[PDB]
Amino acid sequence: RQMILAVGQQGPIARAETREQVVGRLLDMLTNAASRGVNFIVFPELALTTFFPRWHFTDEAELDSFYETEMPGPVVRPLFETAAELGIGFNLGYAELVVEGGVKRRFNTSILVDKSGKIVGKYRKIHLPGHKEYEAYRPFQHLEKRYFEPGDLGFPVYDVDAAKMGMFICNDRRWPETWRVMGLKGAEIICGGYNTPTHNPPVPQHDHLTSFHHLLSMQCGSYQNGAWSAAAGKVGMEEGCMLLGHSCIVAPTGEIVALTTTLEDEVITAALDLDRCRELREHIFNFKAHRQPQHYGLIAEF
Amino acid sequence: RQMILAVGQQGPIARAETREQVVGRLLDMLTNAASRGVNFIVFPELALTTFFPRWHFTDEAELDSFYETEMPGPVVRPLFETAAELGIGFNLGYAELVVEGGVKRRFNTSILVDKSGKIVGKYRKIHLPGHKEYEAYRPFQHLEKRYFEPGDLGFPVYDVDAAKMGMFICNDRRWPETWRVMGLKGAEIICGGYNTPTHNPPVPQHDHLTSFHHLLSMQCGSYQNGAWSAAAGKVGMEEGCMLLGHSCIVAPTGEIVALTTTLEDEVITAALDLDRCRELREHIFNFKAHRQPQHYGLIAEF
Amino acid sequence: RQMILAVGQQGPIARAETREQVVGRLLDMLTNAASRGVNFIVFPELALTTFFPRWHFTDEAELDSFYETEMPGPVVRPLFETAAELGIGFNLGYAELVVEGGVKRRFNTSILVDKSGKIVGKYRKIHLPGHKEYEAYRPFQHLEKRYFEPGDLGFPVYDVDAAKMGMFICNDRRWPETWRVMGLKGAEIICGGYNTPTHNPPVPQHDHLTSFHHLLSMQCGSYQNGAWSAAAGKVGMEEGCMLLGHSCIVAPTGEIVALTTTLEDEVITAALDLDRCRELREHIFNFKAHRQPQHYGLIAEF
Amino acid sequence: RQMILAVGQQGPIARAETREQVVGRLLDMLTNAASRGVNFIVFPELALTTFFPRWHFTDEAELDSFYETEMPGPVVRPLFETAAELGIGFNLGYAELVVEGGVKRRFNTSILVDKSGKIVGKYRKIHLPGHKEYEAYRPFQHLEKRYFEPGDLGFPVYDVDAAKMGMFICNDRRWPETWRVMGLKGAEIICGGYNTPTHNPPVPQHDHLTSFHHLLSMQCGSYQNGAWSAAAGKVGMEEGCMLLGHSCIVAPTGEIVALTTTLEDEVITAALDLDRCRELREHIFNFKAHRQPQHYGLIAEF
């Protein structure tokens, strides 16, 4: 029922920084995480590449190169081997390219891997931010809607060694529905990563609120679900675009219990008692006792 | 499209204080509010009496005394009459007693009254906190589940003058489903009152978070729905039990734009621009563009 | 003893926008303020001009253009006459140019003006931020140390109508000594203006903390000195440079009781009760009861 | 130049809980500290006894029994022997009773002990809070002014192994002077313990701000002096009186990087980069460049 959770935040990944060098950076953080007594570490969204959705692509071949066609391929294998051997679980984000009857599926993906290097769970980003086509005024694009399909896995919850775990990815954290669905499935930890620009071209008047909106979302989702939570950012000045810092671990009371202060590769850690969830989920948010889902119908309509 | 919104926070109402004295207080706060350009004022939950669910009542007639059999009755009409002349809408919370087909129904109720003094909409509290039967292990009782039944109106949104307004009452504010159902209905202002103790007998390790959990809920509900909101507290030491302060008005971005600092009758105000909702709702929280309700079904399951 | 205090936040002022146009804008915030029972409004730092210290000037007559040689000039007189007519006092900041004994003195200056329209006190910025000589690596300049010399009035406290008021300007808010000197002189309201960019060239890895540090400074300054405060920013996108919003009024307990949400000309208001300072000044922060200045010597050394 | 800094927070100590049992509790927090890779751990104010200043003492020998006459005595010595053997530094708070020609000195005291178990610095509480004589109306008393005299060591800074460290004790943290004196002497880490009741009888309309006021003080002190900080509380329900939790570690930017979530014994850690202080102290708070101490004299007057 007890454990140490870490977040391995990443500083920038340049456009042509290779996966071998990124896996190296990931591996260093996994060591820094045995040295602090970590049991499970959370890595960012799209952790193996620069954030390619910021560019408009004209070349299919060039776009596909940012996707994984297998998990792990030879290059990413040392991440898995080392984390098994070290007895550490992890959550990894990556672009998943799947071919089905010669049709191409693109997903923004994250997996849960347990202490033994088994992949025990997958989630595909359901809430895709940004816009569908090139906008010339923007210093950088946000073309997630073109480069990915909305996930088709739902918001599942998985048994990871001794913890029930739920994944969200980036923008997902800002939608109560993300949290609630996994909240109703008993998630004790809800975790994921993000790439969050500190500038928003169409709504620049909220830039100075970037950290606020991010932390607010994590804290409230945690609280209203009695769930531990972790957000692992990829951050700093990446290919000219400032990405938000402030990766966090948050308690089931919505109290942030660990926070990053650098814009670089950074490990943070926090102690989690899976039973703390009880302080909320057997009392003020005792769902079975207090919820009235018959009046919530409008949420599920489409 | 622009208005000044106000919260009329109340200090304690003692057992033996009369509805006429309370209405007196309510009238002054209204007076101060027209003072400061106010178009609409939010009053607390059960604004007409002490917080009676604190005690266990064996005498049915005396329990009945805390309820309204009509709205407004004789004592309350002057609060109405004034605001109709001062052209000032309000939200009033009160305990409601209604007999239908042989049943004596008890509701924790609030109503929206408009500029032209016309009651435009009612809401009856859906999420009742506390417990059903007397609990000796508690220093003071919380018998809302005993003295009220869950509201039968769902979560309506009403046109009040130029603004689409939704109501919550107290514990409702802590449930994302409250906010979401009304956000889906295009509420531009979500408002209500509360009686929130700063001691919670079952989970006293959360006592020092009372402000935090209250404000977190308001700020986040507002942001994730692009709604203005207002929370009107009844506060201070009432019959030996301390009630939480910090009534507030909040912007669609989740920023508190108005907060009270006294534990007494206190009016706070803020300018609202109904179009600011668009900064969230046409962009990051464009429900049509981004929501994926085929994955939310579990929230509506019962 | 009780008043309605206000902050009048400014949107951008263009290099090509005349002082007259700016005065007209200021005059609208005055009208808005009267509308809402305001007795005193705080306007931003260097309220009459674009924030010129961002450029390097070689021609002197043009640098001088941005300064006032008297207060009021014919152009500014209308603001004095209107406020006087409305019975509303104010804190106005401007660039002051005074020639004395063969020296052209340049100050960043603010004034307090009472209900009757009397200039009751002047302050000149003591903690100038930025740099003295042009710097290459800078996406914009911040040359306050070149265009202004550190103010020569100390940190005075003045009676304005019934209130003991002290001024700070911009960067002054971040030095506890600014607050503590005025705290020790019994200031009840500490108020002032600001131009705070959301990007800082030396340390850009704190840009996502811009609002945090602004808010932290105000709240804590108020809490620890038992002072009401208000900080009026000139905000938004001005000549390529993004300036921080979040103009605030703050209670002596450090609670933010009013906050702007736009990046444009905006008026916020709050009731102040000068006797609330007592809650801190007569108790936890009873200076005479608690301070031990024998140990504070290092703070005074130079 | 890098280290791990911990906070060993304490749950309640019973009036008749023996120092042998407290020392045991302390010893176990080292364990947790070594497992998370810790170099220095900070323990609470008066960490060896219950908080006796809440009772009105009339027998002097009973009072004396809460003070230490040596440091360490046999019973406390196991605390020193271990962290020396184990190589951790600690900050321990206690009641110091000293006899000077038959005159009794009474101090509220903390010591820094380095990696090798050597006492390398002392601080005595300078800002004694509370009241000096019995008050009948109070649930619990606060007679620090009677059981201690203000400290006679000022606010020193000490080299502890690789780090320059300053001490504060409890209420000290709410005074900017405390912070500024040690910041001017180049403190990299400013640390101490506290016992902070969530109820204050003379001003109970601030009880709900207890966490706010505490956290706010630590954040702003750290920010404005460019220092890492740590506040280790003794917390929870001690002899009928509820003490505030939220022990913390703060970065030189004011950001909280660790936070306790239980009201029981609890270790938190955070990675400390001693050169990060330069982010503030070589820039915005470049003292030697920006401060204007000839205008701060009033602060040091007495």
- Estimated structural class of chain A: alpha/beta
Helicity level of chain A, as a percent range?
10-25%
Report the CATH C-level class of chain A. Alpha Beta
Query: Termini distance of chain A?
Result: 39 Å
Oligomerization state of this entry?
homotetramer
At CATH level 3, the topology of chain A is Nitrilase/N-carbamoyl-D-aminoacid amidohydrolase
Level-2 CATH architecture of chain A: 4-Layer Sandwich
- Number of helical regions of chain A: 8
General form of chain A: globular
What is the assigned CATH homologous superfamily of chain A? Answer: Carbon-nitrogen hydrolase
Percent of sequence in beta strands of chain A: 25-35%
The run of helices and strands of chain A is EHEHHEEEHEEHEHEEEEEEHH
Largest interface: A-B, 50 and 51 residues
Number of structural domains of chain A: 1
Strand segment count of chain A: 14
Radius of gyration of chain A: 18 Å
The biggest beta sheet of chain A is recorded as: 6 strands, mixed
Reading side by side through the largest sheet of chain A, how are the strands ordered?
5-4-3-2-1-14
Give a verbal description of the structure.
Chains A, B, C, D: InterPro entries: Aliph_Amidase/BUP (IPR050345), C-N_Hydrolase (IPR003010), C-N_Hydrolase_sf (IPR036526). Chains A, B, C, D: The active site is at 45, 125, 170. Chains A, B, C, D: This is N-carbamoyl-D-amino acid hydrolase. 4 copies of one chain form a homotetramer. The first copy, chain A, is of the alpha/beta class and 302 residues long. Chain A has one domain: Nitrilase/N-carbamoyl-D-aminoacid amidohydrolase (4-Layer Sandwich), CATH 3.60.110.10. The first copy, chain A, has helices at residues 19-31, 60-64, 77-85, 144-147, 176-183, 210-225, 278-284, 287-290, and strands at 2-9, 40-42, 89-100, 103-113, 119-124, 157-160, 163-167, 189-194, 228-233, 236-238, 241-243, 248-250, 256-259, 266-273. In chain A, the strands form 3 sheets. A 6-stranded mixed sheet of chain A has the order 5-4-3-2-1-14. The longest helix of chain A is centred in the last third of the chain and has 16 residues, at 210-225. Chain A is globular and about 55 Å long. Chains A and B meet through helix 5, helix 6 and helix 7 of A and helix 5, helix 6 and helix 7 of B.
